[PDB]
Design a binder for this molecule. Structure first.
Ligand SMILES: CCOC(=O)NC(=S)Nc1cc(NC(=O)c2c(C(=O)N3CCC3)cnn2C)cc(C)n1
Ligand SMILES: [Mg+2]
Ligand SMILES: [Zn+2]
Length: 313
């Protein structure tokens, strides 16, 4: 109970920053996650033994895919950690508990294919969950792992506190379905500009947690340029595999996913930053002023993608 995790000095300091990269040493990522729960939540939120057992089962159930992998899980949790730490007082004891767990769990057992590929493949999971297919899977896998023996990290919550935190986690994971992001951000835009946004309204909180989830999920666009650029390679390695599988079903993939259309990457990054990333971090920064570094770093990387187009790299 007196066993504080500590990190080497450069990590200890850099981890507080939004643009922190968790590094290539996989064996340090569990320790980094625990460090963030202890600072974000307290050293008493979770029985350490149960937490460590939970983390290692969660890790085991991420697959060896180029992008939607255990490193993505921890990177997304670290972004949520930075948001929580820069907005100390806005979040309940329960949201702080739930949201680092949701982020760690948000892509459990991902295979590196979109909902669309499953629906066109006719994957069993598309019959069981008609919308937000993978995301209902990820939540389902989260509940499975919580119900393994010695894995209930929530065991000392009351029955209703338990139900609230599993409900925070379920909405949080559903919200990582980017198809849902657009409406969620539009509504947050109106609510904030007409002045009706009320953080005491549970349905409003829900939406603000969903936008945080999109922001943390997309945080590859908010890293220093060399991190952003090398991640883009992993992201496209999955996209191109999915395009290949689309061709195998006899379907021209969208060009984003076609590996014969690599030259169009820089212009597709512009679209994505313009239609998705910048609007996301904009609305987030309006709602949560201290998250501004995410917007500023996204705009830096947009400017780095325009330089790629101008043959300046
Ligand atoms: C209905 C489908 O229609 C459409 O194409 N809409 C849209 S969102 N297209 C789209 C999205 C891109 N996304 C990214 O590059 C990306 C992601 C991302 O989308 N995901 C989902 C898994 C992680 C995360 N980080 N980064 C850099 C790029 C281009 C060229 N196009
Ligand atoms: Mg996902
Ligand atoms: Zn994700």
């Amino acid at each position: 109970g007196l066993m504080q995790f500590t990190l080497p000095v450069r990590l200890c300091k850099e981890i507080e920053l939004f643009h922190f990269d968790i590094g290539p040493f996989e064996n340090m990522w569990p320790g980094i996650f625990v460090y963030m729960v202890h600072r974000s939540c307290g050293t008493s939120c979770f029985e350490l033994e149960k937490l460590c057992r939970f983390i290692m089962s969660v890790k085991k159930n991420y697959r060896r895919v180029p992008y939607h992998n255990w490193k993505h899980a921890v990177t997304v949790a670290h972004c949520m950690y930075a948001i929580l730490q820069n907005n100390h007082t806005l979040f309940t004891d329960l949201e702080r508990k739930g949201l680092l767990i949701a982020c760690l769990c948000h892509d459990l057992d991902h295979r590196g294919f979109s909902n669309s590929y499953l629906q066109k493949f006719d994957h069993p999971l598309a019959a069981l969950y008609s919308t937000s297919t993978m995301e209902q899977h990820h939540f389902s896998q989260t509940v499975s792992i919580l119900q393994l023996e010695g894995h209930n990290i929530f065991s000392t919550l009351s029955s209703s506190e338990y139900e609230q935190v599993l409900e925070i986690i379920r909405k949080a994971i559903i919200a990582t379905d980017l198809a849902l992001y657009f409406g969620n951000r539009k509504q947050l835009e109106e609510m904030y500009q007409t002045g009706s946004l009320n953080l005491n309204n549970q349905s409003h909180r829900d939406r603000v947690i969903g936008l945080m989830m999109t922001a943390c999920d997309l945080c590859s666009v908010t890293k220093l340029w060399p991190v952003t650029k090398l991640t883009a390679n992993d992201i496209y390695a999955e996209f191109w595999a999915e395009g290949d599988e689309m061709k195998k079903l006899g379907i021209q993939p969208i060009p984003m996913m076609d590996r014969d259309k690599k030259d169009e990457v820089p212009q597709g990054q512009l679209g994505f930053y313009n239609a998705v990333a910048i609007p996301c971090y904009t609305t987030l920064t309006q709602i949560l002023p201290p998250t501004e570094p995410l917007l500023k770093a996204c705009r830096d990387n947009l400017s780095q993608w325009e330089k790629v187009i101008r043959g300046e790299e």
